[PDB]
Every structure is written in C-alpha cells, then in structure tokens.
Amino acid sequence: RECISVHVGQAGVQIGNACWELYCLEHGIQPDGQMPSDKTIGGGDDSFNTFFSETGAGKHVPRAVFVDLEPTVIDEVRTGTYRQLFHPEQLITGKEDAANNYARGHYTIGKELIDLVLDRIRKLADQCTGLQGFLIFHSFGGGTGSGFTSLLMERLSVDYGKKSKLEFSIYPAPQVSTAVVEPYNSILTTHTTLEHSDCAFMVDNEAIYDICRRNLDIERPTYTNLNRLIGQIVSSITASLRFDGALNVDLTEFQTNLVPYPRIHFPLATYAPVISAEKAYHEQLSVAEITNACFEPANQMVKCDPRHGKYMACCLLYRGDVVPKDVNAAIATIKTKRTIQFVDWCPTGFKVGINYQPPTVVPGGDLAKVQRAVCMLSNTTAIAEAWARLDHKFDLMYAKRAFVHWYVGEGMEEGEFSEAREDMAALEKDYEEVGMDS
Amino acid sequence: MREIVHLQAGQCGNQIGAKFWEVISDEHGIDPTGTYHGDSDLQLERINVYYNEATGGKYVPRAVLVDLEPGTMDSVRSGPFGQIFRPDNFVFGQSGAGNNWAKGHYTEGAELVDSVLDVVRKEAESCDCLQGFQLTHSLGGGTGSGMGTLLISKIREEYPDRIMNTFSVVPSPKVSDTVVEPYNATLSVHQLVENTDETYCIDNEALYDICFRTLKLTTPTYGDLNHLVSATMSGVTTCLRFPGQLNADLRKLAVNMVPFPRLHFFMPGFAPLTSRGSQQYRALTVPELTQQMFDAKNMMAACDPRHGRYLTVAAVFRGRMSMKEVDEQMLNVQNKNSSYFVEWIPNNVKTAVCDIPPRGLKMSATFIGNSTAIQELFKRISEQFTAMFRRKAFLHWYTGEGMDEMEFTEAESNMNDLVSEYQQYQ
Amino acid sequence: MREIVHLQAGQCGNQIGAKFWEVISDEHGIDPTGTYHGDSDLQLERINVYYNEATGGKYVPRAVLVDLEPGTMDSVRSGPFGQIFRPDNFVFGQSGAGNNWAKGHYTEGAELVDSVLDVVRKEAESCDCLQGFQLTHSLGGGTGSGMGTLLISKIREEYPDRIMNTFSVVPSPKVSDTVVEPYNATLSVHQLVENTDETYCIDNEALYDICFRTLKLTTPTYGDLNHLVSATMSGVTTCLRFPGQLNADLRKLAVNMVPFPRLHFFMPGFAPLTSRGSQQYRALTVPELTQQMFDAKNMMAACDPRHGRYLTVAAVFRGRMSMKEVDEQMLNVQNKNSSYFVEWIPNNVKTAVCDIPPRGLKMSATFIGNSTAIQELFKRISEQFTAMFRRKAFLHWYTGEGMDEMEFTEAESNMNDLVSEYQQYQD
Amino acid sequence: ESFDTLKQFLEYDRKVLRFFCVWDDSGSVFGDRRELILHYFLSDDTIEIKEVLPHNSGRDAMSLFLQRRKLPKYGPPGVYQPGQLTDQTVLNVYYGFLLDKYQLGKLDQEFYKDTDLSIGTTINVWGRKVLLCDCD
Ligand SMILES: Nc1nc2c(ncn2[C@@H]2O[C@H](COP(=O)(O)OP(=O)(O)OP(=O)(O)O)[C@@H](O)[C@H]2O)c(=O)[nH]1
Ligand SMILES: Nc1nc2c(ncn2[C@@H]2O[C@H](COP(=O)(O)OP(=O)(O)O)[C@@H](O)[C@H]2O)c(=O)[nH]1
Ligand SMILES: Nc1nc2c(ncn2[C@@H]2O[C@H](COP(=O)(O)OP(=O)(O)O)[C@@H](O)[C@H]2O)c(=O)[nH]1
Ligand SMILES: [Mg+2]
C-alpha cells in the first residue's frame, strides 16, 4: 500500500511541501508529528500507511526524499514550520546548483550524490512490507530538475525494474520565459523519459494562473496557490489506497487501464469543483454539471485544448457522496455529446471509481467547502501540438548554434543534441500514426 | 442431507455474496452472533445445506473467500453479518490483479490455486453428501475471470460429474466501466462453455431499469442490485431445503433445460416485485404473478426475448398455491405466445412448487429462462473486440505475462462458434 | 359481472369525474381509503361493476386518469376521496396542450397513446365479462376534446362490439371562455357522429338557470354544478348495481331510443331537485315528479323542447313506486300534450323502475329525452364557425400542425347534417 | 420533511465522538471479554466501530468491526423486501418521476443518535449487548 515520493530541484520540493501540509491535514497528524490526544477525527485503523510510518512512541514520520544541490530550499525547510517532522538525514543538500545546465547537473556534480540517494531509497524500501510505485516531482526547465531527474530515474530503474514511476512534473508555457535556455534544458531528458516513464503528467503554469484568475476571485496570484491546487489533485489520485469505497482502483489498475501502447503514456489531469466561497453556495454543485464542466478546454491545466485531438482513455475518480446511477447518466450524456470525439479502437473509453471521503481544504486557503469532488485523468493527442511549440522554439535558437559553448565544457558533447531531436520527431510521428483512424 | 459449496472471488462477486448470506441467514433465522433465533421449526430440519454446525451452536457458513488483494475482504467482515465467516476461509495474496486477465489465470494464479483448493477439499470432507458447486464472480475483471475460471477448470477435473452453478455478472452493453472489458470476456467465455454448464447471467444495466420503473426507485445504489440478485439465487435452491408438492433439485433443473450440450446459458427472474406505495392497491394471485414473470421488460434481461425464441423455461413457485391454477397458467402462456416458443419441443415449461413463502410475502416465484436471444450479448462483446483487436491495442501486458496472440483470435473463433448454435433454431 | 371502465380526460372531465367517485363510494358505504364501512349487505352485492378488489378488504375503483399537464393530478390526489385511486393508472404528459385540438390529437397526446392504452387494455382483462367504457370530457378545449376523441377511435378499432358510453359538455352560445370554442367543438363532432353508441349533451348556460330558479342558489360555484351532473351519470348505471322491478341495463336503453344510426345526442334531467326552503312544503309522489321531470326548465340543455318534437323518452325511476302508477303517468303526459310528440311512434315513452333510492331521498327519478330541439345547439355552433372561418381568423396555430383549409369545411358539412337529419324527421 | 444534507455537514464536518467499549461474552464455549472503539461522525450520524487487540492474542489483523452505517436501535431489523427502502415516494413515471402526496410504504425504522449514546449505559450492536464505559 506504500509509495515512495521523491522531490527534486526547487519546484518539486515546493509542490511537495504543499502536498505534505495537505496530507498532514488530511489525516489527524499535527506538524508536531503526533496524533492528537483530544480530538478524534474518526480516522482509519492504519490508514496513514501510504505516506507515513509510525514510530512506536507515536511520532509518525513521512516517506519522501528531498534532494537539491543548491541548499537554500532545504535549509529553509529545515528551519521553517516543518523542522520537527522530517528525518534529519532524509534531506540532502550540496553547495552548488546547475545554473540552468543539464550537463553541470548530470556529470560535473552528478556522480557525487547518487549513492546517497540510492542508499536512502533502499533505506526506505526495507521497512515497508508493501510497495506500489514511485512518485517523483520535478521541473524540466531547470538543470537540477532535468539532469538529476534523468540520472536518478535511470539508476533507480536499473536497480528495481518492474515498478511504476509517476512523474508529476511542471512543463513550460508560451510567452513566459523564467529561464532563457528552456529547450536546451528540457529536450535532453526527454530521451530517457520516453525510455522509462509510465505516467508523465505535465502541468503548466499559465493555465493555472488563468484558472485561478477566473474560477476563483484571485487577482495577481503567486506560487503557493498553484502548489496547493496540485497537492489536492495528487491526493485525489492517491486516495484509493488510503480510503475505501464502493468502486476503487489502485495504481497498477489505472496503469494497465490508461496506457494503450508502451510508447503512449502521457496523460492529462483536471480537478473539477474549484471555485470561491462566495460564488460556490449560490450554485448547486451537482454531479452532472460537475463532470460536464470537467470537460471544458478552459478548465484544463495545460493550454493545449481538447478540441483538436480525439480522446482515447479517461479515468474519473470520484470522492464524497456519489451514487453510481448519477455517474452512469453522466457517461451517457457525455457519450451523446457531439464535440468530444473518441478514437475507433476504443469502444468503451472510460473508467470510473467511487470513494467515500469528501475533499478536505487546509485552513487559510482558497477553496470552498464542497461535499463532493471528482478528478479526471485523460489522454488525448493534443500534447503533440503542445510539443511542436518546443520543437520550433529549439530550431530557431539552434539555427545560430547559440550557446552550446557552456554545454561543451562539461561532460556531454554535441552528439546527443541531434538524437534528442530525432527522438521527439519519432514521438510526434507516432502520435500521428496512432491518432489516424483505421 | 445434500450440501452445497459457494465460492466467492472478484470484487463484484465477493460483494454480492455478502448480500447473499444475509438473505439466507434471516430466512433460516440465525443472527450475526451465530446463535439460532428463528421462528418456525421448518428452518432447522435442513439447515445443513448451506451452513455447518459448531460447538456451542454458532452456525458457520460454507464459503471460500478468495481475492488477490486484501482490500475487499477487509470490507466484507466489516458488515453486519460479516462476522460469521470462518477465518480459515479467507485466502489472499497482496497485490491487485490490475484489471488484467494475464495476472489472474496463469502467472500469479498458480501461487494460490494450491492454497485455495486446500480449503475447498476441507469443506468436501466436512460435507456429508455433496451435490454441486456455486461460484460468484464477474466476467469483466482480473480476479473474477482470473481466479474463478481456473478454479472451475481445476475442480471438475477432481469431481468429474457434479452440477455447477455459476453466477456471472455480465458486462453491460452501453454503460460499463473499464476499457479492458472485451479482453476479460472473450478469454473466459472459452473455458465456461466447455465446463460450467449453467450460468445465471444478466448485467448491471437491466438491474437499473427494474430499479427505475418496477420498484420506482429514485437513487438506487449498489446495495440494492445485490439484494435484487440475492433473492433469485435463494429461490433456485429452495427445493433442497423446504418441503413442497412437486419439487425439483439441481439435476432436475438440468435435464429439463439442456437439450444440446453447449446450450445452458440462462436468464433469471423474481416474481412479486412491486412499487413501494402501491402494495395496498395490488392483488396477488397466480393469474398475475405469472404476468410479472413473462414479460421482456420487468424481467431481468439486457436483451429482448422478442428478438428470438424461448428454448426451455422453468419457474419455481413458493407459497401455498393451487396446482391447477399453476398448470393451466402455463398452458395459457404457450398458446398466446406460440411464435416465441420453439416448435419441435412439445412441452416448454417446467414447473416446481414449494410450501414455504418468504419473509414478508404470502407467495413468491422465480422465472428462469433459456432462450435463443442471449446471442446478442455474445454478439456485442465480439463486435467490441474486433474493432479493438486488429490494431493490437493492449497486447504487450498480455505479452508481459507470457500469453500469445495465437490464443486471442482462437478465443474469438469460439464466441463466433457459440453464436451460430443459438441461431440454429430460427 | 357486466363491468364498466372509467376514463376521464381533461381539466373539466377530471373535476367532474372526481366528484362522481365521491357520489358512488358513499352509495356503497366505503371510506375515503377504500375500507368498507357500510350498513347494508346489498351495498356489496354488485360492487364489481366499478371496483376491483385489493388485498385486505380494500376496494379500488376502475378509473384511468388522463391529462396533458401534470398539475391537475396533484389536485385530484389532494382531494377528499383522491387517495383511493390506482397510482399506476395516473398517466399524463409534461408540456401543455395550448388549448389546441391540433395538439391533443397530433402532438402532445399522440406520443402518449401507447401508455394510455396499456393501462386501458390491462383493465379490460381483469373483468369477468366486459360491457362498457365511459369518457368524461367537454367540447371546448384541447385535452378534453382532442384526446377524448383520439381515444374513442383507439377503443372501437379494438373492441368494436362493446357498448361505449360518453358524457360530454356542449359549449354554450353566450357563456364563453375561449374565443376558439366553435373551432374546437365542430372538429370533434366528426368523431362522435361515428364512434360512440351513446352521447350526452349538457350546457353550462342552462346549468346556471337551474341554480338560479329551481335550486335558488345565491352564487353557485362549480362544485355544486359538477355535483348536478353526477346524479344523472349515476342514473344510467342504476339497474346494474341494485335489484329492480322493471329494470333496463346499459344496453337495453340504447337499442330503443335511437331510431336511425346517427341520432344519439341525449338530454339529461333529475326530477326531485328542490329548493331548500320548499322541501318542507312539497308533496312527493309519482305524478308530481313527472310534472317536474318533463318540466322545460329542469333539463340541462339550452334548446327549448317546446321548439321541436320528442322522439323517445326514457325515465329511470328509483324508489318503491306502484307500477300501474308509473305506466299511467307516462300515458297522461302524452295525451294532454299531443303535438310535441311525433307521429309514427305510437307509444313515445320508455319506462324503468328500480328499488334502491338515492341517499336520503325516499323517491327519485331521472329523465333522458331525445327531441328535435337539439339542432339549435347545432346551428349556433355552426354559424359561429363560419363567422370566423370566412376570413381565417385563428387558424395558423392549427395550420401550424398542418391541416389545410378543406378539413375544416369537410368537418363542417358533417356538422350541418344534424341540422338536416332533424328537420328531415320533424315534419 | 427535510432531506437536505448540507447544513449539518457545514456545521459539524470534522467532529467525531469516540467511546471505548467492552463486550463481555464469556458465556459462550470459547469467549472473551472484548475491547472495542465506537466512533460516531456528527456530519451524518453514522457509527463506525474498530477493533483493538492485545499483545499476542490469536485473532487476525482484520481492519475493523463494522462499517460506517446508521446503526438500528433494537436488535437486527428484518431484511425487507426490495423497493421498500425508498426515501421519497412516487406517483408515476410520466426517467422522470412525479412525487406522491402521501407516504404509503414508509417504514418506522428507529436509529441510534448522539442522545441515545451516553457514558455508563448499555446498548445493542446487532444483538451484542455492550456498555459504553469511557469517553474523551
Ligand atoms: N510550483 C513552483 N514551480 C516553480 C517555482 N519556481 C520555479 N518553478 C518552475 O521551475 C522552472 C525554473 O527552473 P527550476 O526548476 O527552478 O530550476 P531547478 O530545477 O531548481 O535547477 P536550478 O536552476 O539549478 O536551481 C520554472 O519554469 C517554473 O516552471 C515555484 O516557486 N513553485
Ligand atoms: N452489484 C454490485 N456490482 C458491483 C459492485 N462492485 C462492483 N460491481 C460491478 O463490477 C463490475 C466490474 O468489477 P471488476 O472491476 O471487474 O471486479 P474484479 O473482477 O475483481 O476486477 C463493475 O462494472 C461494477 O458495476 C457491488 O458492490 N455490487
Ligand atoms: N361542471 C363543471 N364544469 C367545469 C368545471 N371546471 C371547468 N368547467 C368547464 O370547462 C370548460 C372548459 O374546459 P376545457 O376547455 O375543456 O378544459 P381543457 O380540456 O383543459 O382545455 C369551461 O367552460 C368550464 O365551464 C367544473 O369543475 N365543473
Ligand atoms: Mg535551486
């Protein structure tokens, strides 16, 4: 029932911090790491087992490894409001980052810490009798979020092998450039993501920027809102191992239930009832409209709209108070709907699941008290049209052979640069070859 | 005197089977402590058929509880009546089946059919004179068609001649859940027709119309469909436990309805299903309990029996009834519908009665039908398969557990073998 | 064992027909929940003409409830004796009829003639030996006159020899609700000159005059008027449920009034309708009913019987009355009034005497008369038709469901034949 | 009557009552005095009961004792006929349903509530006589 969670770079460690407040608040456990003496939350028997291991004194401790070569984020979480919670040796720092360099993050400093991270992974794996998969958080646009990602997952896959790895990762947005060398720092790890990933969930920034602009009453938003939203979605994914409901699916079930071919595993996520507290109670948040507005292009989290490409597999994980005739009528309405076209080698196309624990919102938050929630995980073919953008961002910046001079000084040479590009050409070609109707 | 084994596998089968033993244990009158607190003395004299004695009087059930994951069986004991099952019958691995036919039937399958056959043949010896086997599973998953299709194939090859009950929830036509449904069906349709020789099989879609119109339910959950198919499997097994006038046992309910050896796929029913408020507005005589049974809509069917024929129908009555009014009411139902019953068979209807009405009603019945129109359910799965197989959709996970494409299209050749045989009698 | 099934269509028919079941149920002693609490064993002896046993000693009526809007059926279940009905027999639509004959027949009720009949065809199998039906409607509206007309041609093509009955309000000349009442009525007589075997004519305008002069009510609401039709519509089924001394069932009257196959639009009546102040002052015998029975202001059709000729009169009496005294009073009111009864029918009156009276009345009676006066209702209808039709006033809603301009004139000449076929036999 | 399930949830979302419980069945042939925990969720008035086990007893490590459910008051109520447990009664089906004015097939099913649960009193868990001995 257990799962191992790893947080890499700046962004993965931040969103993991968001996930960890949401899990501690989701169960009864304080930031002091102890279950409380007085308040009874009506918790499970041993239902914290997925993320927490219980020391005999009552202190519950997490399973997550926080690695960053620049020590600033880990040395502020070691002093922040969660200094008490973690294993103090679980958290690995250094003294120099990549400074937006795949090769500096993967070869110049990259050999120095992999024995530490692998030994910590074995040290986690030996107490947990159950094990289900890996949950890895990173951002492609950084050197220590792409190169160290690739290095750790290649060594971890040649250690373990047959187990699923789910990479909950941040992908770049057009017209905003936090870093200048985004394609050079992004396309290189794409070879080994296609070599061994199984659920590579890309999340955008400006899509959530706009969805909190218009669904919520937010003007001028920041990172913490985005991170708590993504943490809500990850708990909605993971809830079927912890809680129990009338129709529930584990991670090898939706791994074997959403992936058609071994080279098409890139789904897309959406959480439906996200709205402010003033507007929330002036509408009924019924199941039919909640799963109908879950199919809007403006309610998605990566800007490639579903209208261009046809769907092939959807999963709808529900939590709260849901009777199955409601969701069956909802599927029938969606199947009678016109604009949402499928692909003619799936007759069926969906998957549903039902759980009996409602959404739970952290105090001082942004979300409304809602009695139900759903989360869809779907794969379409518009992400190839969300990769042609980085193809033609790489091309016009390589046409001057610009700024590979920093890359040639570290370990890698120019030879891998063409291989990554022909790999992505093969990948978008295979999406077109799949998406053609036979 | 004649005792019966009921075997629970899958997520869908384990759950209905939890609702199965609540409709048995209240009609014989033993409460969830295991003590006997029934009313009549006719409940004890054949209590041994499903249940089993224990020291102190805690009557225990005869059921074996298999699931590859521990999630469901940590929720079956957590029910009201769930604290009766013998905890040497709870057998499990530790990983789920992944909604996969590959991880059920062959590879992880050998690691428990050693261990789940070793408790079953402990129940055969504790049984006195056995009769047959019951099994509750679903065709469209990984524990139901994975573990059960093994276990029926490995228990007739121990006991070669016994009757075999199998209660399979078939996948629904237009409203289903998983994308992997035409895989778990066509692989497991092959070993059923060769082995299991009576399947009582109608889906979740047709149970939703019975909820919406006949019972007029507003919000029917999963806890009422189980109560809708637990009653029709406790009235087919009623001439083995209760006295009557013209009573028929599970081999009497085979030779009447297997004309040709591979035509044994039935369709269930349960007669006095009414509304909620309209109890006081309804009369109950066998002239109109024979009318709720013999329609295509208010009987449990995701097919139209008007699009085919009836090959051999049985109907088991309960309660204190006539015998002319039963037998003339099967005369008047073949004459008015002679186009729908076949020729070349002089009598179509078997009829059995009994002398115990259920709890809360003065009479009840169960309409069990073998029909030529069942081939559309075996059509629509094999139409879902061919538009999905030929681009080789999911054939690396089945490759990932050693199973070849040579035995996928070979299983399509036997669904099409079987749809021809029911169609022989146009 | 000679059963009848009740069908009640529209918003006037359901209000009329939910008052009929309060008249009958306390004639037979039964409670507002079908429990028997009566005080006569002959109350039960023929209850199965109109009822149907339910388990536990509760009786349910044989009624099918028809509407195109679902708001009236809540107003009937909310009534006093509403909860006795069959909940599976409540059948109705979603959206309105628009008060169009072109929408009950063609759009709104034509997607419902599978489900009204399956309730109907089930009720005619629970019987022992069926005799009749009865539809309860008016001839001014869409639901009552456009579904109650389609349903008749649904029954008779199935059950062509069972005797159908039909109770119908005819629209008044001067009392008006729609402006489109002649358009509704004239296209509905096209299927009651063909398909009914018994049809009645009741006018709201003459219903008001009884409540002003004879009953002397100050202001009559509908509830007393719908009560007035209930004790004559429960007069033609008196010989089926109680013993008689000269009895005539629902079939014996029909072959004996109607001389030629299209003359079957009868007038009702009720003899001992008395004012509340003049009950203490009144003698009640068999002669004085007849002077009130034939009395031209105690009959519910607004065309004067002194402006025509009678063809045949029935009179279904109730009480314990002498049988010479019945049959000489039906002679005496023919000899003193010779002109208004036709020639070539020597005895112009049929008679019938029962033995169980109404509730509280020691003796009563019920008139039914077939006169040649009824053409006047069939001339002021027909002139108001061509008053609007000759410049096509309100047609492009009926033309919205696409009837051309000949089907309002084809069904206009089928309405003027009753002007002909009554002056054919008047002189 | 109120069938609304929102105001109570908004008021009493994360407030659960807990009573430690004991069931003293040693009058059977092999019985023990058993220790239990009874939860009670104020969001919807449903009782979940857990199992607490000694150091090295022979009982299995199953998850709970009963599920989250509206516990009936006296004994085990009989298992009713299908279609009888509807919350809202219906006149006809015009799927769309028209509601009925009178509730005919509605049943008098009493339940445990927070004022029926108290410290130092004995109740009936599907026949098991227990005594609520402690509280937090
Ligand atoms: N959720 C979240 N994502 C962030 C945040 N800051 C940056 N990102 C993402 O990270 C990308 C920038 O590169 P980083 O991931 O920060 O670089 P890195 O992986 O830490 O590697 P270094 O540059 O060597 O430190 C941006 O494109 C963002 O999408 C943040 O504060 N919160
Ligand atoms: N009646 C009933 N049906 C259920 C229940 N749980 C699941 N099902 C049905 O079982 C079908 C598939 O179950 P499945 O995942 O194949 O179980 P598995 O074989 O163990 O994998 C679904 O379509 C559900 O409709 C239940 O509790 N009651
Ligand atoms: N006797 C009686 N007549 C009524 C009652 N309610 C309405 N009416 C008459 O019904 C006539 C119109 O009904 P109609 O148009 O056929 O209703 P519709 O079928 O729904 O359109 C009016 O002229 C009223 O006089 C009632 O309760 N009793
Ligand atoms: Mg950094």
PDB file of N, CA and C in Angstrom, chain C residues 100-107 183-184 187 389 392 394-411:
ATOM      1  N   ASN C 100     -55.352  23.495 -27.915  1.00  0.00           N
ATOM      2  CA  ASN C 100     -55.466  23.168 -29.323  1.00  0.00           C
ATOM      3  C   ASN C 100     -56.033  21.768 -29.459  1.00  0.00           C
ATOM      4  N   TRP C 101     -57.039  21.612 -30.321  1.00  0.00           N
ATOM      5  CA  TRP C 101     -57.389  20.274 -30.774  1.00  0.00           C
ATOM      6  C   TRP C 101     -56.262  19.676 -31.594  1.00  0.00           C
ATOM      7  N   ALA C 102     -55.510  20.516 -32.282  1.00  0.00           N
ATOM      8  CA  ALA C 102     -54.380  20.099 -33.081  1.00  0.00           C
ATOM      9  C   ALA C 102     -53.173  19.707 -32.255  1.00  0.00           C
ATOM     10  N   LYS C 103     -53.243  19.762 -30.929  1.00  0.00           N
ATOM     11  CA  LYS C 103     -52.123  19.318 -30.118  1.00  0.00           C
ATOM     12  C   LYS C 103     -52.439  18.133 -29.221  1.00  0.00           C
ATOM     13  N   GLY C 104     -53.687  17.969 -28.788  1.00  0.00           N
ATOM     14  CA  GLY C 104     -54.061  16.732 -28.122  1.00  0.00           C
ATOM     15  C   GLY C 104     -54.077  15.546 -29.067  1.00  0.00           C
ATOM     16  N   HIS C 105     -54.582  15.750 -30.281  1.00  0.00           N
ATOM     17  CA  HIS C 105     -54.710  14.690 -31.273  1.00  0.00           C
ATOM     18  C   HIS C 105     -53.405  14.419 -32.006  1.00  0.00           C
ATOM     19  N   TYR C 106     -52.593  15.445 -32.238  1.00  0.00           N
ATOM     20  CA  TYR C 106     -51.487  15.337 -33.179  1.00  0.00           C
ATOM     21  C   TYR C 106     -50.111  15.401 -32.547  1.00  0.00           C
ATOM     22  N   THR C 107     -49.899  16.208 -31.513  1.00  0.00           N
ATOM     23  CA  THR C 107     -48.555  16.291 -30.948  1.00  0.00           C
ATOM     24  C   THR C 107     -48.432  15.786 -29.523  1.00  0.00           C
ATOM     25  N   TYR C 183     -64.254  26.430 -33.131  1.00  0.00           N
ATOM     26  CA  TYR C 183     -63.236  25.657 -33.812  1.00  0.00           C
ATOM     27  C   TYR C 183     -62.932  24.365 -33.080  1.00  0.00           C
ATOM     28  N   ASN C 184     -63.029  24.357 -31.754  1.00  0.00           N
ATOM     29  CA  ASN C 184     -62.741  23.130 -31.021  1.00  0.00           C
ATOM     30  C   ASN C 184     -63.870  22.113 -31.153  1.00  0.00           C
ATOM     31  N   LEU C 187     -64.875  20.291 -35.049  1.00  0.00           N
ATOM     32  CA  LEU C 187     -63.983  19.236 -35.499  1.00  0.00           C
ATOM     33  C   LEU C 187     -63.994  18.030 -34.581  1.00  0.00           C
ATOM     34  N   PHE C 389     -64.518  31.667 -39.880  1.00  0.00           N
ATOM     35  CA  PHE C 389     -63.771  30.909 -40.878  1.00  0.00           C
ATOM     36  C   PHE C 389     -63.677  31.644 -42.210  1.00  0.00           C
ATOM     37  N   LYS C 392     -60.562  33.369 -42.019  1.00  0.00           N
ATOM     38  CA  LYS C 392     -59.488  32.541 -41.444  1.00  0.00           C
ATOM     39  C   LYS C 392     -58.848  33.204 -40.215  1.00  0.00           C
ATOM     40  N   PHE C 394     -58.227  32.484 -36.555  1.00  0.00           N
ATOM     41  CA  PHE C 394     -57.187  31.990 -35.651  1.00  0.00           C
ATOM     42  C   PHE C 394     -56.575  30.682 -36.141  1.00  0.00           C
ATOM     43  N   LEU C 395     -56.458  30.488 -37.449  1.00  0.00           N
ATOM     44  CA  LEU C 395     -56.117  29.159 -37.927  1.00  0.00           C
ATOM     45  C   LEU C 395     -54.639  28.849 -37.979  1.00  0.00           C
ATOM     46  N   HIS C 396     -53.750  29.827 -37.979  1.00  0.00           N
ATOM     47  CA  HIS C 396     -52.372  29.454 -38.265  1.00  0.00           C
ATOM     48  C   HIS C 396     -51.629  28.871 -37.068  1.00  0.00           C
ATOM     49  N   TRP C 397     -52.333  28.480 -36.000  1.00  0.00           N
ATOM     50  CA  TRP C 397     -51.800  27.563 -34.999  1.00  0.00           C
ATOM     51  C   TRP C 397     -52.222  26.133 -35.275  1.00  0.00           C
ATOM     52  N   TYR C 398     -53.496  25.915 -35.593  1.00  0.00           N
ATOM     53  CA  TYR C 398     -53.928  24.615 -36.088  1.00  0.00           C
ATOM     54  C   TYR C 398     -53.266  24.294 -37.422  1.00  0.00           C
ATOM     55  N   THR C 399     -53.114  25.302 -38.292  1.00  0.00           N
ATOM     56  CA  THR C 399     -52.336  25.155 -39.523  1.00  0.00           C
ATOM     57  C   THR C 399     -50.843  25.008 -39.212  1.00  0.00           C
ATOM     58  N   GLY C 400     -50.420  25.374 -37.997  1.00  0.00           N
ATOM     59  CA  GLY C 400     -49.063  25.080 -37.560  1.00  0.00           C
ATOM     60  C   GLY C 400     -48.757  23.592 -37.494  1.00  0.00           C
ATOM     61  N   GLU C 401     -49.717  22.784 -37.038  1.00  0.00           N
ATOM     62  CA  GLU C 401     -49.615  21.338 -37.213  1.00  0.00           C
ATOM     63  C   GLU C 401     -50.310  20.847 -38.469  1.00  0.00           C
ATOM     64  N   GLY C 402     -50.619  21.746 -39.398  1.00  0.00           N
ATOM     65  CA  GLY C 402     -50.736  21.374 -40.790  1.00  0.00           C
ATOM     66  C   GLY C 402     -51.998  20.665 -41.209  1.00  0.00           C
ATOM     67  N   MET C 403     -53.149  21.255 -40.923  1.00  0.00           N
ATOM     68  CA  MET C 403     -54.383  20.883 -41.594  1.00  0.00           C
ATOM     69  C   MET C 403     -54.716  21.966 -42.606  1.00  0.00           C
ATOM     70  N   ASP C 404     -55.009  21.555 -43.831  1.00  0.00           N
ATOM     71  CA  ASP C 404     -55.338  22.508 -44.873  1.00  0.00           C
ATOM     72  C   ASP C 404     -56.744  23.070 -44.679  1.00  0.00           C
ATOM     73  N   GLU C 405     -57.150  23.922 -45.600  1.00  0.00           N
ATOM     74  CA  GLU C 405     -58.417  24.617 -45.475  1.00  0.00           C
ATOM     75  C   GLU C 405     -59.605  23.802 -45.968  1.00  0.00           C
ATOM     76  N   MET C 406     -59.431  22.521 -46.309  1.00  0.00           N
ATOM     77  CA  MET C 406     -60.604  21.715 -46.619  1.00  0.00           C
ATOM     78  C   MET C 406     -61.056  20.880 -45.432  1.00  0.00           C
ATOM     79  N   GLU C 407     -60.161  20.580 -44.490  1.00  0.00           N
ATOM     80  CA  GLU C 407     -60.522  19.707 -43.388  1.00  0.00           C
ATOM     81  C   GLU C 407     -61.306  20.418 -42.311  1.00  0.00           C
ATOM     82  N   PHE C 408     -61.438  21.735 -42.398  1.00  0.00           N
ATOM     83  CA  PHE C 408     -62.354  22.472 -41.542  1.00  0.00           C
ATOM     84  C   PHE C 408     -63.710  22.665 -42.198  1.00  0.00           C
ATOM     85  N   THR C 409     -63.798  22.459 -43.512  1.00  0.00           N
ATOM     86  CA  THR C 409     -65.048  22.506 -44.255  1.00  0.00           C
ATOM     87  C   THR C 409     -65.608  21.111 -44.518  1.00  0.00           C
ATOM     88  N   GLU C 410     -64.732  20.108 -44.650  1.00  0.00           N
ATOM     89  CA  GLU C 410     -65.169  18.714 -44.659  1.00  0.00           C
ATOM     90  C   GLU C 410     -65.834  18.338 -43.344  1.00  0.00           C
ATOM     91  N   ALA C 411     -65.273  18.790 -42.233  1.00  0.00           N
ATOM     92  CA  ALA C 411     -65.866  18.581 -40.927  1.00  0.00           C
ATOM     93  C   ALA C 411     -66.822  19.696 -40.537  1.00  0.00           C
TER      94      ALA C 411
END
